[PDB]
Amino acid sequence: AKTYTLTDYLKNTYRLKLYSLRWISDHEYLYKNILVFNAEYGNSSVFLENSTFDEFGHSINDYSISPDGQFILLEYNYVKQWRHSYTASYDIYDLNKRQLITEERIPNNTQWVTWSPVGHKLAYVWNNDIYVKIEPNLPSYRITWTGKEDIIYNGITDWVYEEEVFSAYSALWWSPNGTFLAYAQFNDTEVPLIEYSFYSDESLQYPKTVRVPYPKAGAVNPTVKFFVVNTDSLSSVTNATSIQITAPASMLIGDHYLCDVTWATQERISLQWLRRIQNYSVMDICDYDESSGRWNCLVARQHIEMSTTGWVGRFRPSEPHFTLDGNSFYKIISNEEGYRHICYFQIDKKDCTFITKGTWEVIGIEALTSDYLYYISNEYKGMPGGRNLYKIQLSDYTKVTCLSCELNPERCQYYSVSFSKEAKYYQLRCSGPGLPLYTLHSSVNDKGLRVLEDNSALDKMLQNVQMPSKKLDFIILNETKFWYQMILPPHFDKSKKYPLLLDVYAGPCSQKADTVFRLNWATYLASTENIIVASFDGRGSGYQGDKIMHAINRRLGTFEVEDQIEAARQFSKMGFVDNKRIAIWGWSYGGYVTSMVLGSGSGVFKCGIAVAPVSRWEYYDSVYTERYMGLPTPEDNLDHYRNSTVMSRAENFKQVEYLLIHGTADDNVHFQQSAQISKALVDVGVDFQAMWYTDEDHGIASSTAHQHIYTHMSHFIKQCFSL
Amino acid sequence: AKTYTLTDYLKNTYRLKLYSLRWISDHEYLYKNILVFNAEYGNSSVFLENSTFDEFGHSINDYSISPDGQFILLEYNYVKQWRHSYTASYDIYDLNKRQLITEERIPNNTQWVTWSPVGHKLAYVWNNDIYVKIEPNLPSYRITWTGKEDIIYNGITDWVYEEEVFSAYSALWWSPNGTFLAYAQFNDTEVPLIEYSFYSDESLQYPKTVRVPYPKAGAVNPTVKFFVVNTDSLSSVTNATSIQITAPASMLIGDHYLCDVTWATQERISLQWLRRIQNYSVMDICDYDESSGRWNCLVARQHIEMSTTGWVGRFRPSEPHFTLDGNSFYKIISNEEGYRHICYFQIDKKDCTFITKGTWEVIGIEALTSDYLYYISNEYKGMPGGRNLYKIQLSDYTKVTCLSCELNPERCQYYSVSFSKEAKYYQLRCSGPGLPLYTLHSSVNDKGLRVLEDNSALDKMLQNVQMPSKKLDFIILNETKFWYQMILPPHFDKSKKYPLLLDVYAGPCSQKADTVFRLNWATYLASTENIIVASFDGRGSGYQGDKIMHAINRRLGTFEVEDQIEAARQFSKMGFVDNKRIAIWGWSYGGYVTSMVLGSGSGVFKCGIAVAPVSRWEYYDSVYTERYMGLPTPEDNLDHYRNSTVMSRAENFKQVEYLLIHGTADDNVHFQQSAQISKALVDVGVDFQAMWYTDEDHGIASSTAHQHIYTHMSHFIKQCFSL
Amino acid sequence: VAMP
Amino acid sequence: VAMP
């Protein structure tokens, strides 16, 4: 049988089928031409002919149907900016008239657009200001006049809020029936700019300098304000009043972040604020006052969330999930033993009640009805790298049902879920350890309705390939279980010695040992090159409690590095590893850890590859870096900021073969970071291999560059292993 | 016996001794730590003790003694800018009262300073304006008030005039007795900026963006004005009056350059101007008019120099050498056969008389007396790569005497010369093919007075080393001789097959085949690695007449690339060349030619290395590129600008191993050029090797980067050749 | 997030 | 030039 070759990986010879649906109601979903499916019976009818927009004249990047099904928003001229942000053009098509709307069009270069949650109002951001359309074909109402490129952002995030706080460009939040539009405003006036060249097509005679407001660690941060406007009022001198809700006094005393916005009712919004020292967070719960038209946050309804051992949240304070009446909410919180569990709050009582407990964690709350809360956790079989859907009875917390554990326990140990609008149906998505499996279920009695996609065609194809296998297991260190996985070559033989590649990420709350089925570079390395590809979750890794997660607090570049080295020693002791052929590689945080390990002097590793590494924490952005590292000042944590750089280890790279790779247009981990590694290596006379990727960003993900980088790394590894 | 190793090259184990002297009169020179030598007898005295400034408190970069010997300028705080420009601090030491001047000091960050040619006046440039000190302890007179960083340059050149026109930062020209100070003013207002990142020490949190006014091919050029000020009539009360000399009408009709300034007498200055289309040049000869205080350039004294086959001059129109009375001058000019020879002009006649002729060229005019003109030529033995000193009797041009040909014909075939103030003495500097030899001579009867430095110490060290040899020969393409050289391994055995590295530069008017002795990377490759290192001078190369030189006019990247391929073909058919192991490398113009050869699909070359290559002429500066290429417009030469890029040849690199290297702070050949090469290779799926040098410029010449680059290239060549 |  |  053939093996899984590099060309198979790079050409996507063997494709995972998906089943990506969009719920439009409690019982229908859209699926791609466009069909609408009835969840209960599985029958479909054609929702939008794949010929409808043949003559449209543009390629349509995406669509979005209004909640009342009356209009479809068509996105085209898509132009990517950062991880989530982009600009696009939009047309609106009227589904009753079968007419495109040609009047009062959304402008070109629109930065964000969203329907109201009911009806068909639109809110959009253009040139950094917010506009509202009550009707798709009528004029917009301007909401803000302060928008200013790179300086004032209304309703959209700046770079660091996009990447590290909201994971979204959008900073607009409609109230549930669409009366109110809440939004944040960011002021980057004094935030320094990262500047880097962009070369563009070769016809561009002068390179272009990209300038992005980007606060590196300890620098001046954007400031933020929060506003709510009543869009039903757009009957006042066209000038609706934006009512500010100010941060609490405990936040205003210093630098802070707005880190969560969640509406609770039509007239009640909750906001969470986080101090720049991210171990103290405050939730305000604010009610509309009909008589004054203002928003009041009763101090009795304020909730404090703080951490004595670390930062707050996995990456930020968790979202609340409110009961329908808005008088109570559920929220994932670290319990007294350090494990993240669901706590039940009354809005005006400070003590919450944990409704789950144990030596495992809740991953997320997925749906809440009058009777049940549904959540994903890694409880099943005590496997932190597995994921299952559970439902807990709100009137009796001792009644907890695992909805997914036993559906196919051999094939399916990693689930996510997508519920319909009022949770009357749910799609389960199993992603491993076998082939992904998508199924539909009815919540009324948790019956499997039908298999949506089982990947049987890919199964048949893979049967003719010498696929690697995957072992997921643990080693005990200091009476603590630490999980690892190995991608093992086909016909793996414990009596033989294999080269081993340690595939590292190891950032705070990371998890590289899990039950997910992947087809990736490691699949090729194991299948064709007979390399064991191993990953290990040491101190700092996620989903196993705060004692493990917070072990690297204020100390990035220490234990999570040491534990990758120890893991390699442990794997060598297993007897199937050629200890003369151990390599290490990783991307981003993984390139940082790879580099730290290669500079450690441990002698364990022959060679390694760092792709877009962090090299010095003062080069990375404030929100992420300070969360773990505090401030780079003599009074706080400067000594460890300066002790944890790659460059200070340059001399030790004389012991190893290193390949350093970075895209020149990386807005996230700046090319600067690898520019300083290479300069430090040159300064101590260390030879190494290098590759820049012109105009590639942090993902080095254009089609050609993706192929080029994995080809180049494959050559390096094979050379290192005398393959 | 040891070989000449890579470490010998990089650590300078074998150092050529020099003899750098500074003539201060017709009979004495300074020699430094600081002694003064009498040329007639060879006796010396101490002029300045090495202990005088022990207590100075700054490291002294350089010194400059005033022409009258009374003062010394001490240069310190040296900070390099481009190839010639730098700033420094200056102190002036009074050699008679043995005091530093503490009053009216030259400012810190001075950009240029120079003594008058007689006496001890000073002119300096600070913050882009010109200042004159009549006495070292007196207040300065400010001459210009318009200087503005990156915009208005008084008495200093901007980037492109520094690099491509004057090969100097200075744009100040004292008259012979110091009465007048002439100066150019450059206006870069509309010149675009090249922008690139500079990373600095790792302490710098945000990279700096460097912005340099730099016209790429076809872009808006700096404009230029020319002024003369009388430094004897400066006033403390009123601002100095500068008299402008305007370019002639044939230059003012369009873009142009000031390209030469040469004083003829105390009251006569000549200027040469060059059209932006560089095949037409005009010399003005301007006389001071005492009645009006004006400078008048009579039209009858104007001299036109044009080219029908290429540009004017080797790189620019040549400098005139005026007689004592300034009524006539000698100038190197391409004759009617296209060979550059000495022409004798009268200041008011259009026709000049060639005083030399033949199928060889005059390299430079070196000294002029009433009886003789002294010049360097490659006439001897018809070897274009040899250089000898000649004198020609001005009353009988048939009486030409070679003064250096027969001194030491086996050792010395390449001379330069340095004459005392009125040619009573000269120093000859022999630089090959044997070890450099410095000798002192008197002009009266061309007696050889003394051996100044014969490198006998290094000669005896090198006896203990297996040194390579050099063969200089020619091959015949279309009944034209084209010369090559080969660095041959020790114990060279014509019956064995050696790998061959083609070391290429091949720019217009270049010469890589010569009789010069060098200790360089090729010495190590031949001595230790037993690689033949060959170089070839094909079409476009210099010193052999315009038929060869102008062959690449308007057509860079065609014949000079094909001719390297043809040379390598010829070499590959020699019985001592392994045709499986031929490589090519070059730097800058040589990196362009290397890349164009590797992309040609010839199949001759296994591998090659491009260091800081040009890749597309639109990326290079206007003055150099347009000289050869004209303008990149559809009406002029855009098609060949677009046909001659490296990027268009990317597909052909599938056949070869390529190493692409570039400094990120290259102000000259911008990193952009290699960034576009790499992107085009990635886009066609070609693997290659790369190395960037953080913050290195075009020279990649810091101690550590120089060691690193040659080490990395040595690994690449060895693996390419299986060593 | 330092991650691709 | 583009020389060195």
Side-chain angles (χ1 to χ4, degrees), chain A residues 1-32 34-723, chain B residues 1-32 34-723, chain C, chain D:
Chain A
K2 70 181 298 298
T3 65
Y4 187 83
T5 67
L6 178 62
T7 323
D8 290 328
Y9 172 54
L10 295 180
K11 301 303 183 180
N12 213 25
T13 301
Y14 300 106
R15 256 161 227 111
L16 291 172
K17 286 174 147 154
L18 315 177
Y19 198 95
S20 269
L21 57 76
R22 305 193 173 160
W23 293 106
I24 60 167
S25 67
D26 212 25
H27 63 283
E28 299 198 301
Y29 65 82
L30 301 176
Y31 178 71
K32 197 301 281 182
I34 297 333
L35 322 191
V36 53
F37 280 80
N38 181 281
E40 199 173 12
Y41 311 115
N43 58 307
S44 62
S45 71
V46 174
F47 184 91
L48 213 46
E49 226 50 68
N50 67 344
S51 62
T52 310
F53 308 108
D54 276 353
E55 315 275 55
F56 177 68
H58 299 277
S59 157
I60 290 288
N61 179 66
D62 211 345
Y63 70 97
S64 172
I65 74 87
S66 69
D68 63 4
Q70 287 178 23
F71 297 93
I72 171 148
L73 188 63
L74 320 166
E75 185 181 274
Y76 65 101
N77 288 340
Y78 167 96
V79 184
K80 175 171 177 303
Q81 174 179 68
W82 314 131
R83 189 188 304 269
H84 310 288
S85 48
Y86 63 86
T87 60
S89 305
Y90 297 90
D91 291 326
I92 305 160
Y93 175 87
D94 187 326
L95 291 164
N96 277 299
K97 284 169 129 233
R98 284 155 37 71
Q99 287 263 330
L100 214 46
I101 297 172
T102 47
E103 327 176 358
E104 295 291 346
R105 278 193 315 160
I106 297 160
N108 292 317
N109 314 107
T110 286
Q111 296 158 297
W112 180 253
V113 56
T114 177
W115 293 109
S116 51
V118 311
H120 52 245
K121 300 174 184 189
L122 283 162
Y124 65 89
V125 179
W126 176 81
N127 290 347
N128 287 41
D129 281 315
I130 299 165
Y131 296 80
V132 168
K133 286 163 72 73
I134 304 294
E135 302 293 338
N137 82 296
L138 296 185
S140 301
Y141 303 87
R142 190 161 177 176
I143 304 302
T144 63
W145 277 268
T146 54
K148 185 158 121 179
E149 186 172 43
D150 296 332
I151 296 161
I152 306 297
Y153 302 75
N154 296 288
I156 50 175
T157 50
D158 72 345
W159 189 93
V160 74
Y161 267 92
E162 170 176 348
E163 172 70 6
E164 305 298 6
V165 182
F166 287 110
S167 293
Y169 195 27
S170 170
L172 294 184
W173 299 270
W174 285 104
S175 73
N177 76 6
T179 290
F180 299 107
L181 179 66
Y183 64 95
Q185 178 196 80
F186 308 96
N187 187 338
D188 285 52
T189 292
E190 313 193 80
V191 177
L193 309 168
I194 180 66
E195 302 197 343
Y196 55 86
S197 296
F198 193 89
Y199 302 93
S200 195
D201 306 329
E202 72 169 280
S203 70
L204 181 68
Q205 180 170 46
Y206 289 85
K208 244 181 191 220
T209 301
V210 180
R211 292 162 182 110
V212 187
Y214 182 119
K216 294 166 176 280
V220 172
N221 270 346
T223 59
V224 56
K225 297 177 177 176
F226 191 76
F227 301 91
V228 186
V229 65
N230 184 333
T231 70
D232 282 349
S233 84
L234 294 173
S235 89
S236 47
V237 69
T238 329
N239 213 177
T241 284
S242 285
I243 304 302
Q244 190 175 351
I245 301 178
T246 57
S250 59
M251 281 305 150
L252 292 179
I253 74 161
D255 284 355
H256 58 274
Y257 308 112
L258 176 71
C259 62
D260 182 277
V261 180
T262 301
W263 281 94
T265 73
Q266 305 310 341
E267 301 190 7
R268 174 175 295 147
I269 188 165
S270 73
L271 312 181
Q272 295 174 72
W273 303 90
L274 181 66
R275 288 190 172 152
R276 185 167 179 165
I277 308 314
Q278 296 180 41
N279 61 4
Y280 194 89
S281 183
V282 178
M283 179 189 302
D284 260 338
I285 297 170
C286 311
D287 296 5
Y288 181 71
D289 188 330
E290 214 205 71
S291 290
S292 64
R294 327 250 335 151
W295 290 82
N296 290 312
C297 318
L298 279 161
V299 173
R301 305 184 165 160
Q302 202 174 81
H303 298 269
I304 307 292
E305 182 176 344
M306 78 176 103
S307 177
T308 43
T309 49
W311 56 97
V312 177
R314 287 192 173 107
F315 296 88
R316 58 200 52 97
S318 64
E319 45 281 82
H321 298 254
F322 283 89
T323 69
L324 181 64
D325 68 3
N327 291 323
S328 60
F329 61 90
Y330 300 85
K331 192 184 203 290
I332 298 173
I333 295 301
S334 184
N335 72 12
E336 230 188 91
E337 296 294 323
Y339 289 87
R340 287 169 197 286
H341 279 287
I342 300 160
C343 219
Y344 176 52
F345 294 76
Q346 310 284 327
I347 58 163
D348 67 348
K349 282 198 208 313
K350 303 316 165 78
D351 300 293
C352 65
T353 304
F354 279 107
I355 76 168
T356 67
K357 64 191 225 143
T359 300
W360 49 269
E361 300 204 321
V362 181
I363 306 300
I365 297 167
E366 303 304 309
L368 180 61
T369 72
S370 36
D371 295 330
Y372 287 109
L373 181 155
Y374 302 81
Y375 69 88
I376 297 285
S377 81
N378 56 17
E379 180 178 7
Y380 190 57
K381 309 213 163 133
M383 293 172 59
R387 302 280 184 277
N388 278 288
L389 178 68
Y390 296 80
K391 99 161 169 178
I392 176 160
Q393 187 168 57
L394 298 184
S395 65
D396 179 5
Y397 301 146
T398 72
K399 302 318 189 253
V400 175
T401 305
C402 192
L403 302 180
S404 62
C405 289
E406 314 274 356
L407 297 174
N408 198 328
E410 295 64 55
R411 180 178 175 172
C412 289
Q413 305 163 358
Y414 204 104
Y415 286 88
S416 58
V417 66
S418 172
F419 282 90
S420 67
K421 281 319 181 183
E422 315 291 321
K424 163 182 315 263
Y425 302 92
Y426 52 101
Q427 179 197 40
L428 285 172
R429 311 89 74 82
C430 152
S431 66
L435 297 179
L437 176 59
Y438 302 81
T439 53
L440 200 69
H441 307 263
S442 67
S443 321
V444 74
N445 258 302
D446 293 310
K447 295 342 280 193
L449 292 166
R450 67 193 68 76
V451 175
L452 296 171
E453 172 62 61
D454 64 6
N455 272 300
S456 59
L458 172 68
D459 192 65
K460 315 286 163 313
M461 297 293 112
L462 289 184
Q463 265 160 42
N464 308 342
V465 194
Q466 318 198 35
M467 288 310 268
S469 62
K470 172 168 175 183
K471 194 194 200 313
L472 177 64
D473 207 356
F474 60 85
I475 57 172
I476 311 185
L477 303 173
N478 299 353
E479 311 185 35
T480 303
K481 295 174 164 94
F482 289 102
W483 292 77
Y484 71 90
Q485 58 175 54
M486 291 189 177
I487 310 292
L488 300 166
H491 316 293
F492 172 73
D493 183 351
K494 247 151 190 293
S495 68
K496 316 223 270 273
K497 292 223 141 74
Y498 293 82
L500 184 136
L501 175 60
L502 188 62
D503 174 352
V504 58
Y505 183 71
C509 205
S510 63
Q511 182 167 76
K512 290 277 281 178
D514 65 23
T515 57
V516 174
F517 181 84
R518 301 180 174 88
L519 296 176
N520 58 12
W521 189 47
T523 310
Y524 144 71
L525 292 175
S527 178
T528 294
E529 305 297 342
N530 298 298
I531 296 162
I532 297 177
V533 184
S535 302
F536 180 76
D537 286 335
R539 282 174 284 178
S541 62
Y543 314 108
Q544 305 157 77
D546 288 349
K547 194 186 168 202
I548 287 173
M549 201 172 70
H550 291 173
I552 57 165
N553 188 51
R554 294 169 63 79
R555 285 313 189 251
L556 299 186
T558 63
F559 298 129
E560 84 280 34
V561 177
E562 297 164 47
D563 293 349
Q564 295 296 306
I565 300 165
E566 196 33 49
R569 288 184 196 111
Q570 293 282 321
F571 300 149
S572 89
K573 280 194 234 252
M574 300 185 172
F576 45 70
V577 176
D578 179 357
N579 79 332
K580 297 200 56 203
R581 292 193 289 167
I582 307 179
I584 178 167
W585 95 281
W587 202 308
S588 207
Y589 204 106
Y592 172 69
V593 174
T594 293
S595 302
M596 289 301 276
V597 164
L598 287 170
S600 68
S602 81
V604 173
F605 297 90
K606 185 168 193 275
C607 64
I609 306 171
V611 186
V614 171
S615 67
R616 160 166 174 126
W617 284 112
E618 276 155 285
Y619 300 156
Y620 201 56
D621 69 66
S622 56
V623 177
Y624 180 96
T625 305
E626 296 170 8
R627 185 181 310 143
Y628 315 104
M629 287 278 285
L631 293 168
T633 65
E635 321 76 63
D636 189 353
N637 202 27
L638 177 59
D639 287 349
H640 184 61
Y641 268 91
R642 310 260 149 111
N643 232 54
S644 62
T645 76
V646 171
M647 279 74 83
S648 67
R649 305 187 170 204
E651 190 76 35
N652 282 336
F653 280 76
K654 292 178 177 168
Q655 326 218 346
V656 305
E657 285 170 36
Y658 185 49
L659 169 53
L660 179 62
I661 306 178
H662 213 127
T664 64
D666 194 331
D667 54 285
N668 185 345
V669 178
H670 300 141
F671 184 85
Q672 166 196 43
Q673 305 232 35
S674 287
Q676 297 285 10
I677 295 171
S678 67
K679 184 155 56 66
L681 294 174
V682 172
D683 284 357
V684 295
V686 169
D687 194 35
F688 64 100
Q689 306 273 84
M691 179 59 76
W692 75 82
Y693 279 98
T694 300
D695 291 350
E696 288 298 305
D697 72 4
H698 198 53
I700 311 174
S702 76
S703 172
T704 50
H706 173 77
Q707 296 181 81
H708 198 273
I709 188 178
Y710 278 99
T711 299
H712 196 74
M713 301 188 291
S714 298
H715 291 311
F716 180 83
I717 293 295
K718 294 178 70 155
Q719 178 273 141
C720 175
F721 284 168
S722 309
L723 297 179
Chain B
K2 67 173 307 265
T3 67
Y4 185 88
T5 66
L6 176 62
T7 308
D8 292 328
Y9 168 54
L10 292 181
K11 299 306 187 171
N12 289 291
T13 302
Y14 300 106
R15 313 224 92 200
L16 295 169
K17 271 133 345 224
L18 315 155
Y19 198 98
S20 304
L21 57 84
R22 235 264 293 143
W23 288 111
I24 59 175
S25 70
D26 205 40
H27 79 130
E28 293 192 320
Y29 65 83
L30 298 174
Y31 180 75
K32 192 175 148 62
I34 277 147
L35 310 188
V36 50
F37 280 78
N38 179 288
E40 184 179 18
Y41 307 117
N43 60 304
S44 64
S45 299
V46 182
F47 186 87
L48 192 135
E49 287 206 17
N50 66 2
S51 54
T52 303
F53 312 107
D54 281 348
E55 263 218 303
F56 180 64
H58 310 276
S59 191
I60 282 165
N61 187 71
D62 208 349
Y63 76 80
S64 169
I65 292 154
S66 64
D68 64 6
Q70 289 176 27
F71 305 89
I72 197 170
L73 200 62
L74 307 172
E75 184 179 277
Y76 63 98
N77 294 333
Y78 169 95
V79 178
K80 179 179 172 293
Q81 193 186 41
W82 311 131
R83 191 187 307 271
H84 310 289
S85 48
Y86 62 89
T87 61
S89 300
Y90 292 88
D91 280 327
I92 290 148
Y93 182 79
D94 189 314
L95 291 160
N96 303 122
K97 62 190 37 74
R98 297 225 63 90
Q99 280 217 327
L100 284 170
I101 289 52
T102 40
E103 350 253 1
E104 299 304 331
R105 293 209 290 211
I106 295 151
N108 292 320
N109 312 294
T110 283
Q111 294 161 299
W112 179 249
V113 55
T114 173
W115 293 112
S116 53
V118 289
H120 53 244
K121 299 179 184 175
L122 284 157
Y124 66 87
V125 180
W126 178 71
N127 288 349
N128 290 35
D129 281 316
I130 297 165
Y131 298 81
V132 168
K133 289 165 71 72
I134 300 298
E135 300 292 351
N137 78 328
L138 299 204
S140 293
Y141 304 88
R142 185 160 180 179
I143 307 298
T144 62
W145 297 80
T146 51
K148 190 173 181 212
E149 190 178 15
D150 294 332
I151 298 282
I152 302 304
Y153 304 73
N154 298 293
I156 49 175
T157 55
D158 73 342
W159 190 95
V160 78
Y161 265 92
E162 166 179 347
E163 172 66 16
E164 306 295 8
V165 182
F166 289 111
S167 301
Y169 197 27
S170 172
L172 291 185
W173 302 268
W174 282 107
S175 64
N177 75 4
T179 293
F180 298 101
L181 180 67
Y183 67 91
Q185 179 193 78
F186 306 95
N187 188 338
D188 280 53
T189 291
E190 299 169 70
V191 175
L193 296 175
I194 181 61
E195 304 194 343
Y196 57 88
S197 296
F198 196 86
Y199 299 95
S200 189
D201 298 342
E202 84 171 87
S203 62
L204 182 68
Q205 187 170 41
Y206 288 83
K208 309 279 136 283
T209 295
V210 178
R211 299 170 173 100
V212 184
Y214 183 115
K216 294 172 176 272
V220 175
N221 266 349
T223 59
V224 58
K225 298 178 170 183
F226 188 78
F227 302 93
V228 185
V229 59
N230 188 325
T231 69
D232 290 341
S233 35
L234 299 173
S235 182
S236 306
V237 190
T238 86
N239 285 328
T241 291
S242 289
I243 307 295
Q244 183 170 2
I245 301 178
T246 55
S250 64
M251 294 291 160
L252 296 172
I253 42 152
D255 287 353
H256 55 279
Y257 308 110
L258 179 66
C259 67
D260 182 279
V261 178
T262 301
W263 281 94
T265 76
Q266 305 299 350
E267 301 185 16
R268 177 175 295 156
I269 187 173
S270 72
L271 315 177
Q272 295 173 72
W273 303 91
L274 181 62
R275 290 186 169 155
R276 189 169 175 162
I277 304 296
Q278 297 183 39
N279 60 8
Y280 189 102
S281 165
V282 180
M283 185 189 289
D284 257 341
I285 296 171
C286 312
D287 281 13
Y288 181 69
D289 179 347
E290 214 169 356
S291 310
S292 56
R294 280 189 161 127
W295 289 86
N296 314 106
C297 318
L298 297 150
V299 191
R301 293 183 174 173
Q302 200 176 271
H303 294 273
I304 301 174
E305 189 179 339
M306 66 192 72
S307 176
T308 68
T309 52
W311 54 98
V312 180
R314 283 183 177 119
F315 296 89
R316 64 168 173 159
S318 65
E319 86 266 12
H321 296 254
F322 283 87
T323 56
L324 188 32
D325 61 26
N327 295 326
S328 62
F329 59 90
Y330 298 86
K331 191 185 202 288
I332 296 168
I333 290 310
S334 181
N335 75 9
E336 308 94 317
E337 334 298 312
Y339 290 89
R340 288 169 195 286
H341 280 289
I342 299 157
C343 218
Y344 178 45
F345 292 81
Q346 318 283 317
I347 64 175
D348 55 359
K349 302 286 199 23
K350 315 287 216 189
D351 300 323
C352 68
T353 302
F354 281 106
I355 79 176
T356 63
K357 65 159 110 83
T359 57
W360 49 268
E361 296 195 329
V362 178
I363 306 303
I365 300 167
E366 303 301 313
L368 181 63
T369 75
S370 69
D371 298 325
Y372 288 98
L373 180 157
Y374 295 85
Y375 65 91
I376 298 289
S377 85
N378 58 13
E379 179 177 10
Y380 194 52
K381 303 197 156 135
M383 301 174 60
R387 305 278 183 272
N388 282 105
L389 176 70
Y390 295 79
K391 71 181 186 189
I392 181 167
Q393 199 179 275
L394 299 180
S395 72
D396 182 355
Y397 300 145
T398 69
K399 302 283 191 67
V400 174
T401 306
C402 192
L403 301 176
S404 63
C405 293
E406 313 289 343
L407 295 174
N408 213 326
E410 172 165 294
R411 179 180 179 169
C412 292
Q413 299 164 5
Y414 203 104
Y415 286 92
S416 61
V417 69
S418 172
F419 279 86
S420 71
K421 266 317 198 282
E422 55 254 359
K424 183 142 101 143
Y425 300 95
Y426 51 99
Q427 175 199 42
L428 282 177
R429 311 81 73 72
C430 153
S431 76
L435 294 184
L437 171 58
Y438 299 78
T439 57
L440 197 65
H441 307 251
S442 55
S443 299
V444 152
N445 292 108
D446 301 298
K447 293 180 161 45
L449 294 171
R450 54 201 77 73
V451 174
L452 302 170
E453 168 66 58
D454 60 15
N455 275 285
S456 53
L458 178 64
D459 180 54
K460 279 160 162 283
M461 298 302 340
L462 289 180
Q463 310 279 50
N464 219 10
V465 185
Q466 294 188 56
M467 294 301 284
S469 63
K470 184 165 158 183
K471 157 168 253 272
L472 177 68
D473 206 349
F474 61 82
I475 55 162
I476 289 306
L477 306 195
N478 282 160
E479 299 149 54
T480 301
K481 292 192 194 189
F482 294 96
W483 291 77
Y484 68 93
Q485 61 171 49
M486 283 186 185
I487 311 300
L488 299 172
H491 311 301
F492 176 69
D493 193 333
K494 226 166 181 63
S495 65
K496 322 167 154 103
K497 304 263 200 254
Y498 296 79
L500 187 144
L501 174 62
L502 193 56
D503 173 354
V504 57
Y505 182 72
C509 204
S510 65
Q511 179 168 84
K512 283 281 277 178
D514 64 26
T515 58
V516 179
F517 182 87
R518 311 185 167 83
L519 295 173
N520 60 11
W521 188 48
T523 312
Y524 145 71
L525 292 173
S527 180
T528 298
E529 307 297 352
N530 296 301
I531 297 164
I532 297 168
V533 186
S535 303
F536 175 76
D537 288 330
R539 281 172 288 179
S541 62
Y543 312 110
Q544 305 152 77
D546 289 348
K547 156 153 221 64
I548 289 168
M549 200 175 69
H550 288 172
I552 54 176
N553 185 52
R554 296 173 60 77
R555 288 292 181 280
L556 302 187
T558 60
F559 293 138
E560 83 280 34
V561 175
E562 304 156 39
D563 288 351
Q564 298 294 309
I565 298 167
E566 182 49 29
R569 278 197 194 91
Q570 306 246 348
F571 301 158
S572 80
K573 285 160 189 181
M574 295 167 175
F576 55 82
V577 174
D578 180 0
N579 73 352
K580 295 326 181 283
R581 286 187 303 161
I582 301 171
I584 179 169
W585 94 281
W587 201 308
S588 206
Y589 201 107
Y592 171 69
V593 175
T594 292
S595 298
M596 291 295 269
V597 164
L598 289 173
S600 68
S602 82
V604 171
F605 299 88
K606 175 159 187 324
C607 64
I609 311 174
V611 185
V614 165
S615 67
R616 161 166 174 127
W617 289 110
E618 286 163 271
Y619 296 159
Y620 203 56
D621 72 62
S622 55
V623 177
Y624 179 96
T625 307
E626 299 167 7
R627 180 185 304 143
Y628 312 109
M629 277 306 266
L631 299 178
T633 62
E635 324 80 270
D636 188 352
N637 204 27
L638 178 60
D639 285 350
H640 187 65
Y641 270 89
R642 299 283 164 81
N643 290 334
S644 59
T645 74
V646 172
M647 283 74 84
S648 63
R649 294 176 178 220
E651 195 34 60
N652 288 326
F653 281 73
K654 265 192 253 284
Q655 308 221 291
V656 305
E657 305 158 56
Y658 183 53
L659 172 56
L660 177 63
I661 307 174
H662 213 125
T664 64
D666 197 326
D667 55 286
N668 186 342
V669 178
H670 303 139
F671 183 87
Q672 166 193 44
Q673 305 229 41
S674 282
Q676 297 284 13
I677 295 183
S678 67
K679 182 154 57 65
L681 296 173
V682 165
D683 285 353
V684 294
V686 172
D687 188 43
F688 64 100
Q689 318 305 296
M691 172 77 53
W692 74 81
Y693 281 98
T694 299
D695 287 353
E696 287 300 309
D697 74 5
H698 200 51
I700 313 182
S702 74
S703 165
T704 51
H706 168 77
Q707 286 167 114
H708 197 274
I709 186 172
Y710 277 100
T711 296
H712 194 80
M713 294 195 286
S714 302
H715 289 319
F716 179 87
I717 292 295
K718 287 159 82 33
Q719 72 74 17
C720 173
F721 286 169
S722 308
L723 302 181
Chain C
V1 189
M3 159 184 318
Chain D
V1 261
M3 161 76 55

